[PDB]
Design a protein around this ligand. Structure first.
Ligand SMILES: O=c1ccn([C@@H]2O[C@H](COP(=O)(O)OP(=O)(O)O)[C@@H](O)[C@H]2O)c(=O)[nH]1
Length: 435
């Protein structure tokens, strides 16, 4: 039996994608060691059905610990943003423990995420082949890489333009970019990517040319589950396709000013809404009423519901009352919205999100709320797009394209993983000859 150790980055989205990939490999006769911090293994274990207990084993990775940064904070999930540098640094300091794990388990293959250049280095030292699994899309990487080589040539195929807000943010930054691109460039033979050709095929081919590496799609990896009861009762009283879900993912906390723009945009649109509002794991001034404009929920009345902490995002997107998704455009959230046929109203915040929103706009399965020249969210833009997409329904093309994408994604099956499995098999057979 071929054994694979998988090392996701410490974000819930990355862990979720890695777990879906692990389940696919388990069905193809692979044994998976799934390695992360204990707080992350706790969060992800409920998503793993009992039938995988024989083929997927959870393995603890230890990070340096102190009372000021204790193990329950060794995840991005609800982490105070000011602790994100410490989390990246602590993760890099797990390389010694990671090496001991690889020595004890001796897997045939390492599959590692794009935020850990130490991981393929440890594997190479132990003669363990290692493959990068990038859990996000290709559009942003290619859009970012092209202008370094070709600053005077227009990016091919697309009309996307990155807003000056994010151009200034991504202009330390070089070190993070070099480390991220190293994880892709160091990958043995192929890069596995959590995307699909109907959405990103031409960008996959171009990134493969830019990197001089073969790129292998592993498809939309969407978790589907089999709190919500109260929510379903409220949603069942709404009209079909009348409600937006509002979420900014697992590792972002909109500022009070950003929340004010979102809230007033929801109010002016007159849409029904379910909004997940979260506070970082150490925030004691945690108030939904304080965080939101005064009187907002009382003015919204029957139309608005705020969920504190975590919401059943997939179940809500699948409810027939849901007509749009006001999303930070994290990649798993985009893939879920497309899988369930829900138009996206993009409010990207950082990292790959602005690129993801551009791809959504280009594919026609959503629209993007544009920021002002100073990089600020605009209540008027939020209200206008919800009005057109959801309330008044003058942008039916977005709903039509999302539903067509949903039918394409629902048609896919286990063959989505054939190319990955063949490439893993070939790599291992070649490496065995080289010893
Ligand atoms: O209240 C919430 C917020 C997020 N999610 C899930 O958390 C993941 C978020 O991953 P994504 O890539 O969209 O963004 P990130 O958290 O990495 O910024 C998605 O599967 C969402 O369905 C959820 O279930 N409930």
């Amino acid at each position: 039996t071929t054994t694979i150790l998988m090392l996701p980055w410490l974000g819930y989205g990355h862990l979720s994608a890695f777990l879906e990939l692990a389940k696919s490999l388990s069905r193809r006769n692979f044994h998976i060691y799934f390695c992360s911090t204990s707080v992350n293994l706790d969060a992800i274990k409920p998503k793993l059905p009992s039938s995988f207990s024989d083929s997927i084993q959870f393995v603890e990775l230890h990070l340096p610990s102190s009372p000021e940064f204790p193990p329950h904070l060794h995840t991005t999930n609800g982490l105070p943003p000011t602790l994100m540098p410490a989390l990246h640094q602590a993760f890099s300091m797990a390389a010694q423990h990671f090496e001991s794990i690889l020595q004890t388990l001796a897997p045939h293959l390492l599959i590692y995420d794009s935020l850990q250049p130490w991981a393929p280095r440890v594997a190479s030292s132990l003669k363990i082949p290692a493959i990068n699994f990038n859990t996000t899309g290709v559009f942003g990487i290619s859009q970012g890489l092209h202008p370094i080589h070709y600053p005077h040539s227009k990016f091919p195929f697309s009309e996307f333009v990155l807003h000056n807000h994010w151009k200034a943010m991504y202009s330390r930054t070089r070190k993070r970019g070099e480390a991220f691109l190293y994880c892709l460039h160091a990958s043995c033979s192929v890069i596995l990517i959590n995307s699909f050709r109907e959405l990103e095929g031409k960008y996959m081919d171009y990134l493969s040319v830019l990197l001089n590496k073969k790129v292998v799609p592993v498809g939309p990896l969407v978790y589907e589950p089999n709190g919500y009861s109260s929510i379903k009762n409220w949603l069942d009283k709404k009209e079909p396709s009348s409600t937006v879900f509002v979420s900014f993912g697992s590792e972002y906390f909109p500022s009070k000013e950003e929340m004010e723009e979102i809230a007033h945009g929801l109010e002016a649109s007159e849409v029904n809404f379910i909004w997940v509002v979260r506070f970082p794991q150490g925030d004691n001034t945690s108030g939904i009423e304080d965080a939101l404009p005064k009187g907002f929920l009382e003015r919204a009345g029957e139309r608005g519901m705020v969920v504190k902490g975590w919401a059943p995002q997939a179940k809500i997107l699948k409810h027939w009352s849901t007509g749009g998704f006001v999303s930070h455009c994290g990649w798993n959230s985009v893939m879920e919205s497309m899988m369930f046929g829900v138009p996206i109203i993009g409010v990207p915040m950082h990292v790959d999100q602005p690129f993801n929103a551009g791809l959504v706009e280009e594919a026609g399965v959503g629209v993007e709320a544009k920021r002002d020249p100073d990089g600020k969210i605009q209540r008027d833009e939020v209200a206008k797009l919800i009005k057109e997409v959801v309330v008044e329904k003058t942008r039916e093309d977005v709903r039509k394209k999302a539903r067509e994408m949903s039918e394409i994604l629902r048609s896919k099956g286990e063959e989505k993983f054939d190319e990955m499995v063949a490439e893993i098999s070939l790599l291992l057979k070649i490496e065995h000859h080289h010893h």
